[PDB]
Amino acid sequence: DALKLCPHEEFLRLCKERAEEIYPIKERNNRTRLALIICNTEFDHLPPRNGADFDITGMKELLEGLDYSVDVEENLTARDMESALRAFATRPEHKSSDSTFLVLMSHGILEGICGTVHDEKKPDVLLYDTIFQIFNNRNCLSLKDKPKVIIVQAARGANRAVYKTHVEKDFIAFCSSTPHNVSWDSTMGSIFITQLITCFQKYSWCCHLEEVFRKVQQSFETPRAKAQMPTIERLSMTRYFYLFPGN
Amino acid sequence: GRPMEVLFEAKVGDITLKLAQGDITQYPAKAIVNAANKRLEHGGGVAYAIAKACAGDAGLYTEISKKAMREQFGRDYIDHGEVVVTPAMNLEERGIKYVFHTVGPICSGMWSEELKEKLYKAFLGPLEKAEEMGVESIAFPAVSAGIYGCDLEKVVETFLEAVKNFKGSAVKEVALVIYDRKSAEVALKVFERS
Numbered sequence A: 001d002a003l004k005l006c007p008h009e010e011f012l013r014l015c016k017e018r019a020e021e022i023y024p025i026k027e028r029n030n031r032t033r034l035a036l037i038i039c040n041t042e043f044d045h046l047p048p049r050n051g052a053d054f055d056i057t058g059m060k061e062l063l064e065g066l067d068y069s070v071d072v073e074e075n076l077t078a079r080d081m082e083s084a085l086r087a088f089a090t091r092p093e094h095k096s097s098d099s100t101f102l103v104l105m106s107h108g109i110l111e112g113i114c115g116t117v118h119d120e121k122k123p124d125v126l127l128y129d130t131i132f133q134i135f136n137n138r139n140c141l142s143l144k145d146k147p148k149v150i151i152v153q154a155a156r157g158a159n160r161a162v163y164k165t166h167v168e169k170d171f172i173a174f175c176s177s178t179p180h181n182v183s184w185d186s187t188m189g190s191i192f193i194t195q196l197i198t199c200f201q202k203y204s205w206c207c208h209l210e211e212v213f214r215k216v217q218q219s220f221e222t223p224r225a226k227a228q229m230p231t232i233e234r235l236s237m238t239r240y241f242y243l244f245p246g247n
Numbered sequence B: 001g002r003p004m005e006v007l008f009e010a011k012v013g014d015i016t017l018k019l020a021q022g023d024i025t026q027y028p029a030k031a032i033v034n035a036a037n038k039r040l041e042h043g044g045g046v047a048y049a050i051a052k053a054c055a056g057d058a059g060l061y062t063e064i065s066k067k068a069m070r071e072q073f074g075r076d077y078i079d080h081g082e083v084v085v086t087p088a089m090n091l092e093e094r095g096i097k098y099v100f101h102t103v104g105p106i107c108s109g110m111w112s113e114e115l116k117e118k119l120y121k122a123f124l125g126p127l128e129k130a131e132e133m134g135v136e137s138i139a140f141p142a143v144s145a146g147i148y149g150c151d152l153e154k155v156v157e158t159f160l161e162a163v164k165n166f167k168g169s170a171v172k173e174v175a176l177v178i179y180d181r182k183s184a185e186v187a188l189k190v191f192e193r194s
C-alpha cells in the first residue's frame, strides 16, 4: 500500500488545458514545499492520545511522498503551538513553494485545539481563528494565492466588519472531532488518519484535494460510522488543488 | 464450573502463594486483578472476559470502571502502579468481591529495565491496594504477557519479585492464574527455579 503516482504527460496536460481552474504547480527542480505536523500525545491533565505515534509517522511519510519537507512538533503548549505556527509562516522556503499542509492533532474544544497543559479551570487553547489569521493574505505573503490545507484532528471531551472574506483566502480545513477511542491493534492508529492516508494513496493521482476529502467522507457514509463524519470547514479555495504525485 | 488446578503452593513469609491453571473469573479470591489499559476500556483480553462476567455486557463494566477511576483518582486515566477498584457484581456468586484494575506496559516483544519497572509496579500496586483495604486473598493474571507482548517468563519472574518484596499482614493468599496449559507449564518452571 503506497502512493499511486500520476504520469507526467497527464501532469503537463491538466496544467495546460485547465490552467485557470487549478492551482499552479512550481517546477519540481526549484520547488521547496514545506509541511508542519503538530501532535500532542501526552498531557498534564488529560488522557493520553494512544496511537498518535502511528498517525505522526503515517502523515509524515504521506506528505514527504507528496514532495513536502515535514517539520514535526510534539507535545506543545498552546503558547508554543502559536509560536511554532508563526515561525512556520515566516519560512523563506514558502516563496519557492506552491502550497502547504498543516496537520494538527490533539484534544479539542469548540473554539480551538488544546495544548499539553490544558484543563477546564485553567485553559490552554489555540483558537482556530488565530491559526487562519497567522496564515492569511495580510500576515503570510509567501503563501498568498497558494492553497493552505489544514487537517485537524481535535478530539472532543477535553472539557467535561467581515475583513475575513478579503484576507482569508485559499484555505481548506478537514476536521475530525471524534472523542479519542483508539484501540489499545498495533497495526494502526486513529480511523480518521488511516482513512485519510488510504484515500490519498489511492486517489491523489487522479482527483484534486476536495475530491480526495469526499472519498474519505464516503468511507464514513454508513450507519455505524456516520456520527464520526469528518467535515470540510472554512473553505476559501478559488481553484482546484491537484497534487500531481511524482511531479 | 471449569476445572481450577493448583500446580504449585508455597509460603512467602506468612503469604501462601499459589499457581493455578484456569479461568480467573472463576477463581475463589476476594479480589481478582484485571490486566487493563490506562483508560479502563475493556475491549479485549482478560479485561473483556472480566467485564462481561461482572456486568453481562463488557461495555457496561467499562463505564462503571471509568466512573470509579474518576472518583478514586480525580482523572480519566491511570498510570503503572495505580489501581482502580470496582465491585465484582455478578462474580460475587463465585466469592469474588472486587476487581482491581492494573495497567502493565506494552513490550511488543522487547524487554528492558524500564519495561520491567513498569510491570513491577503493576504487580505490586494491587498487592498494596489489597493490604490497604484488608483484602485477604487476591488472584493475578499474567499482566502484559498477552496482547501487550511481554515475555511470559519475564512476566512471571517480575510477579514473583513483587510478591517477595511485598510487606503486608492483611494479605494471606496470593494466586497467579494462567488460562492455557502451555503457558501454565512455563510459569511452573519459573516458580520452581525461584
Ligand SMILES: N=C1O[C@@H]2[C@H](O)[C@@H](COP(=O)(O)OP(=O)(O)OC[C@H]3O[C@@H](n4cnc5c(N)ncnc54)[C@H](O)[C@@H]3O)O[C@@H]2N1CCC[C@@H](N)C=O
Pocket (backbone or CB within 6 Å): A183, A184, A185, A186, B022, B023, B024, B025, B035, B036, B037, B041, B042, B043, B044, B045, B046, B047, B048, B049, B104, B141, B142, B143, B144, B145, B146, B147, B148, B149, B177, B178, B179, B180, B183
Ligand atoms: N482493550 C483492551 O483492554 C486490555 C489492554 O488494553 C490490553 C492488556 O493486554 P495484556 O496486559 O497483555 O493482558 P491480556 O488480556 O492480553 O493477556 C493476559 C494473560 O491472561 C491470559 N488470560 C486471558 N483470559 C484469561 C482468563 N479468563 N483467566 C486467566 N487468564 C486469562 C492471556 O492468555 C495472557 O496470558 O488487552 C486488553 N484489550 C484489548 C486490546 C487489544 C486490541 N486492541 C488488539 O490489539
